[PDB]
Amino acid sequence: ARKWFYKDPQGEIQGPFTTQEMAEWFQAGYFSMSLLVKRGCDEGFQPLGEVIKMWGRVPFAPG
């Protein structure tokens, strides 16, 4: 399922991406803790560090 979005430094929304695509980019080091991310169904973009705090784990991993 394609459901992940992020905002690039120029404010443009990118997506939708699969969880596996996000996991790949996260493990490769492309995503900082300040990157604004959300699922389509979510209310608002949040920094990835805060998403991890909210979810209790990195959201792209198995749970």
Partner: peptide, 8 residues
């Protein structure tokens, strides 16, 4: 492929 928009 790098993530669009993040690496120019």
């Amino acid at each position: 492929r790098p993530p669009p928009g993040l690496t120019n």
